[PDB]
Amino acid sequence: QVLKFTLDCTHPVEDGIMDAANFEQFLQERIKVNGKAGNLGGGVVTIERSKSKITVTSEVPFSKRYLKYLTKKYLKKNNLRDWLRVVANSKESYELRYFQI
Amino acid sequence: PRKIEEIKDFLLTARRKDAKSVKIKKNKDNVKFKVRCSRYLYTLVITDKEKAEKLKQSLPPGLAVKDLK
Amino acid sequence: SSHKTFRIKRFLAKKQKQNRPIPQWIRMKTGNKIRYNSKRRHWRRTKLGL
Amino acid sequence: VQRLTYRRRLSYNTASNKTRLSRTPGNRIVYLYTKKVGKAPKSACGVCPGRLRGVRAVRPKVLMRLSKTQKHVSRAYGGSMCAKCVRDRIKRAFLIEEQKIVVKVLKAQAQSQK
Amino acid sequence: RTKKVGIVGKYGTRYGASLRKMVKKIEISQHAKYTCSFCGKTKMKRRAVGIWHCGSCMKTVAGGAWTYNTTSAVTVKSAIRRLKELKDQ
RNA sequence: CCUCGGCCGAUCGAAAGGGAGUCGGGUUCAGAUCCCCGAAUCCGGAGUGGCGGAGAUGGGCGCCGCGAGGCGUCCAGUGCGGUAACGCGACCGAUCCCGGAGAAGCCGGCGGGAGCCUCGGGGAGAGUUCUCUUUUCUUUGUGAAGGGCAGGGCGCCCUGGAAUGGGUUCGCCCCGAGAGAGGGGCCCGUGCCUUGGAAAGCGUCGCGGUUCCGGCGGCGUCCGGUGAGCUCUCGCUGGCCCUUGAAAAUCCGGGGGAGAGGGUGUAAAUCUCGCGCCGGGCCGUACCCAUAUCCGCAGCAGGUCUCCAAGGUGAACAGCCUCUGGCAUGUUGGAACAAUGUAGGUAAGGGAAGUCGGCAAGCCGGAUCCGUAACUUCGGGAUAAGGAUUGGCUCUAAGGGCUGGGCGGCCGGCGCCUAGCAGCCGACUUAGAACUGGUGCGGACCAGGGGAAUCCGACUGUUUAAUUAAAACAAAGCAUC
RNA sequence: UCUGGUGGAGGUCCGUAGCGGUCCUGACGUGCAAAUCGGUCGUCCGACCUGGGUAUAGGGGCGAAAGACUAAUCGAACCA
Numbered sequence: 001q002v003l004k005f006t007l008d009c010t011h012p013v014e015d016g017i018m019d020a021a022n023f024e025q026f027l028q029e030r031i032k033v034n035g036k037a038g039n040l041g042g043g044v045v046t047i048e049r050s051k052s053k054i055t056v057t058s059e060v061p062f063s064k065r066y067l068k069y070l071t072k073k074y075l076k077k078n079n080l081r082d083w084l085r086v087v088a089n090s091k092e093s094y095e096l097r098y099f100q101i
Numbered sequence: 102p103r104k105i106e107e108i109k110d111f112l113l114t115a116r117r118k119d120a121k122s123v124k125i126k127k128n129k130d131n132v133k134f135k136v137r138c139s140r141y142l143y144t145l146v147i148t149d150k151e152k153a154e155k156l157k158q159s160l161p162p163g164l165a166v167k168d169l170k
Numbered sequence: 171s172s173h174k175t176f177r178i179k180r181f182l183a184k185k186q187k188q189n190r191p192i193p194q195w196i197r198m199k200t201g202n203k204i205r206y207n208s209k210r211r212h213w214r215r216t217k218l219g220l
Numbered sequence: 221v222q223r224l225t226y227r228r229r230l231s232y233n234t235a236s237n238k239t240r241l242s243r244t245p246g247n248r249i250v251y252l253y254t255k256k257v258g259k260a261p262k263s264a265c266g267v268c269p270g271r272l273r274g275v276r277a278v279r280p281k282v283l284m285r286l287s288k289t290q291k292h293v294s295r296a297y298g299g300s301m302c303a304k305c306v307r308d309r310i311k312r313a314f315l316i317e318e319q320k321i322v323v324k325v326l327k328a329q330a331q332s333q334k
Numbered sequence: 335r336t337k338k339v340g341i342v343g344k345y346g347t348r349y350g351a352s353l354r355k356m357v358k359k360i361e362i363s364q365h366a367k368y369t370c371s372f373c374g375k376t377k378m379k380r381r382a383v384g385i386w387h388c389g390s391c392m393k394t395v396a397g398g399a400w401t402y403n404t405t406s407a408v409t410v411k412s413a414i415r416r417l418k419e420l421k422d423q
Numbered sequence: 424c425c426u427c428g429g430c431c432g433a434u435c436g437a438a439a440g441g442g443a444g445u446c447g448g449g450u451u452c453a454g455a456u457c458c459c460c461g462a463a464u465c466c467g468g469a470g471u472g473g474c475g476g477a478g479a480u481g482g483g484c485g486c487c488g489c490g491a492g493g494c495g496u497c498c499a500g501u502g503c504g505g506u507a508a509c510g511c512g513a514c515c516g517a518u519c520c521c522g523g524a525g526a527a528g529c530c531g532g533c534g535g536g537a538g539c540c541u542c543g544g545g546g547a548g549a550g551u552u553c554u555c556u557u558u559u560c561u562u563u564g565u566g567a568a569g570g571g572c573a574g575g576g577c578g579c580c581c582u583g584g585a586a587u588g589g590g591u592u593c594g595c596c597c598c599g600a601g602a603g604a605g606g607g608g609c610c611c612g613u614g615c616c617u618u619g620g621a622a623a624g625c626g627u628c629g630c631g632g633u634u635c636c637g638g639c640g641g642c643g644u645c646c647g648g649u650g651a652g653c654u655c656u657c658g659c660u661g662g663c664c665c666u667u668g669a670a671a672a673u674c675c676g677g678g679g680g681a682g683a684g685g686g687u688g689u690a691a692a693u694c695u696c697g698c699g700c701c702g703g704g705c706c707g708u709a710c711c712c713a714u715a716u717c718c719g720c721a722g723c724a725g726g727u728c729u730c731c732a733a734g735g736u737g738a739a740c741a742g743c744c745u746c747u748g749g750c751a752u753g754u755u756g757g758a759a760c761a762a763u764g765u766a767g768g769u770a771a772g773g774g775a776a777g778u779c780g781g782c783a784a785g786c787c788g789g790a791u792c793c794g795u796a797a798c799u800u801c802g803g804g805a806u807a808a809g810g811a812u813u814g815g816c817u818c819u820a821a822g823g824g825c826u827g828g829g830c831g832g833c834c835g836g837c838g839c840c841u842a843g844c845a846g847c848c849g850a851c852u853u854a855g856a857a858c859u860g861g862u863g864c865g866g867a868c869c870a871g872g873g874g875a876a877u878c879c880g881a882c883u884g885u886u887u888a889a890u891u892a893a894a895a896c897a898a899a900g901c902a903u904c
Numbered sequence: 905u906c907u908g909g910u911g912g913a914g915g916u917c918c919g920u921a922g923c924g925g926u927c928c929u930g931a932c933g934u935g936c937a938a939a940u941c942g943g944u945c946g947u948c949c950g951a952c953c954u955g956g957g958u959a960u961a962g963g964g965g966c967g968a969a970a971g972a973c974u975a976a977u978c979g980a981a982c983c984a
């Protein structure tokens with residue numbers, strides 16, 4: 001009854017334009033459980049990273065479109081919406097890809 | 102379209118000289134055997150894969166068989 | 171209108187076929203006096219007897 | 221909101237231009253032209269206000285492609301008279317015939333004795 | 335609700351007081367439901383002028399224009415019974 | 424040749440009346456419920472039976488057969504079930520007769536269903552991110568025809584016998600001519616599931632060949648809640664009428680029983696049952712449908728019959744702003760901002776002194792709470808007249824629905840829901856209060872000035888299309904011939 | 905008899921669409937128009953508005969009556 005959602009940042013980190021560690025702290029700080037930011041909702045939601053693959057797990061109702069809202073805000077803050085887009089490559093994962101010609 | 106709930110009735114419909122083709126479709130939950138006749142398309146819904154493979158072997162000879170893959 | 175009889179349609183067919191310009195070789199015929207089709211009918215300008 | 225158009229050349233809201241809304245497998249809303257509502261037979265008695273039971277309420281010309289059982293009730297005067305008035309005519313026929321025999325016997329006995 | 339206008343309050347001031355008074359009597363009788371003499375139920379309404387219907391026994395009777403029984407009808411029925419009885423006895 | 428036999432008379436008359444039967448997906452530069460794909464359906468024909476099923480295959484007397492089951496004879500059989508309402512797949516039948524459907528007004532009020540709008544979440548894509556917003560926008564299917572189940576309706580049936588009258592609607596209305604209660608029956612079923620059906624359509628992410636392959640592939644097309652909401656439609660029940668709101672083709676049911684069938688075969692006549700075979704000819708179909716395809720001499724501010732109808736404000740299909748869709752300002756542009764004009768405003772102090780005349784303009788205007796005269800045909804006059812309030816914000820009180828009542832059950836005294844308690848769910852208002860702004864608040868939009876009298880016509884209605892809308896005409900009532 | 909509800913009548917009132925056409929004697933008046941335009945107005949469940957089909961033809965028709973209308977023509981149309 002737990003929800004596992006993942007985020008792929010392989011391409012941006014290979015190019016060096018993205019910091020995976022900076023993403024962890026952004027999602028750790030600017031994330032809400034029951035409308036309150038910080039503290040990860042008393043530890044109910046957790047974030048892990050492994051090789052630029054940020055996984056978010058929770059047991060309370062948690063929607064991955066909320067994460068797409070958060071990653072878009074991260075990209076805009078870092079001036080990356082002009083080269084990167086967030087695409088659902090699976091049922092439970094998003095992936096950061098470039099714009100083709 | 103008519104829904105047939107018996108295998109014995111399906112074999113009778115398939116062996117009709119009116120019958121033209123048997124179309125087998127595989128879904129996530131069932132397999133549907135469809136026999137096209139002059140007036141109605143007779144569909145048989147089978148939820149067991151073991152019985153589904155048996156029906157393919159017992160289909161009458163000569164009748165066209167198409168797999169909707 | 172779209173709803174029309176066979177008699178009316180055949181009448182409109184004939185007026186359509188006779189609304190053509192004069193052929194060019196007619197001017198070259200010996201003793202020719204026709205310079206243009208003086209019976210040309212435009213749909214917006216002149217209406218049919220029907 | 222998607223707006224609709226007539227599928228036929230009749231542009232007037234007549235009794236034969238009635239339509240309903242149907243959603244297609246193409247996720248479009250279209251007009252479907254509906255048949256008129258049929259009425260079940262009214263009893264031949266002339267006093268019962270309600271319709272007959274057991275008979276399909278369809279338009280008259282469709283009535284000829286139904287089976288006979290859908291058009292009648294298994295009883296004398298089945299699909300033409302109600303049960304209540306069929307009962308009354310059985311009793312009315314019997315009781316009047318009984319009175320006629322009584323009257324004939326009474327007039328025959330009176331004639332013989334007078 | 336009203337002092338005297340009764341059922342002809344629907345006409346307001348639009349006709350004379352005397353004309354509204356005359357039609358008041360007729361409109362009460364033409365819309366009243368009478369007791370049916372055949373079934374005993376008080377359901378004898380008026381279909382049209384001279385036509386009276388009972389909604390329980392489904393009997394239609396020819397009556398008066400606004401009242402179920404006209405006085406001329408009652409006198410004639412009683413007179414015909416007298417003339418018939420004189421013929422018989 | 425007998426028998427039957429009323430045409431109660433030819434024929435014409437509706438592309439809005441009646442009138443069997445088709446709907447999804449794709450396809451064009453322009454066609455399409457018409458072409459292709461798919462799934463259906465009506466009518467007509469089938470003689471020389473197209474195949475099944477039904478009719479229709481029982482009983483008695485014996486004999487043999489261990490007995491089952493067979494041999495002979497005789498007699499049935501134009502189906503069957505339910506107390507009933509009626510039901511089942513068919514379930515013979517002519518002249519003749521009866522009936523039904525086609526086939527009925529307008530208005531009101533309720534209820535059911537659908538479409539649309541709305542609200543809470545979950546996906547996919549997009550917009551914004553200067554700060555916030557877990558946000559804002561889009562999208563989130565299942566045709567006809569069958570089968571099943573909800574749901575709606577019923578003056579349909581059976582038991583039974585009601586006053587201490589009861590049942591019940593928003594209103595009514597119903598009952599010893601049979602209420603309430605219980606149990607059934609029928610009709611409609613445009614709703615849901617299902618066959619059709621996901622293979623197709625749409626969304627999104629990729630991979631191909633080449634101008635097109637309905638290319639190929641992955642994932643999805645989800646779960647709920649509301650309502651006097653609007654529209655359509657199906658019902659129920661009322662009101663009005665000195666107004667009672669088509670006809671005929673066509674189809675069906677019933678009454679009767681003239682006839683037909685076969686003698687016990689594995690049979691007959693017959694069959695409105697299931698499937699199978701063949702056909703459906705003729706004409707119309709493009710497009711405009713109007714501030715540019717029609718009429719007005721024209722691309723003419725005129726005229727010309729309909730259908731569908733989103734968000735916000737608000738009583739509203741009012742006016743004002745917006746979305747889907749559409750457009751280019753209405754047969755030209757540039758510059759300037761004179762007089763006179765057309766259209767729209769404002770004005771100190773007076774306040775009709777103007778003028779034939781308050782013409783024109785202006786005042787009033789919504790809603791809530793108070794308060795309303797003379798006169799009167801007692802209905803009205805009446806929004807008479809006159810007065811107060813109206814914003815924003817933060818609260819308070821009241822107004823409802825469902826479920827429950829001493830691993831899973833239950834044979835049980837052992838429990839007692841009873842000043843209606845607990846939990847869960849939910850929308851729209853009303854009233855009161857505090858605070859607050861340069862007293863501003865129906866802030867735009869929408870939106871009656873009023874009173875005292877005289878003349879005429881009673882009122883509503885009508886009239887000189889293109890100078891007269893009136894006191895003229897009509898009208899109900901009265902009277903006369 | 906009075907009171908509070910319910911109910912939803914009416915050639916009922918305000919007022920949209922529709923139908924009509926008061927006043928400005930406004931605009932225009934070689935017009936957009938051989939009768940139109942704007943504001944303001946009357947009515948808006950009824951003696952209501954409207955399409956198609958039908959019937960009545962010129963000393964005739966039709967007229968809730970103005971000598972009105974009868975194809976821009978009416979105190980007897982138009983055509984020869």
Ligand SMILES: [Zn+2]
Pocket residue numbers: 370371372373374375388389390391392393
């Ligand atoms: Zn009666």
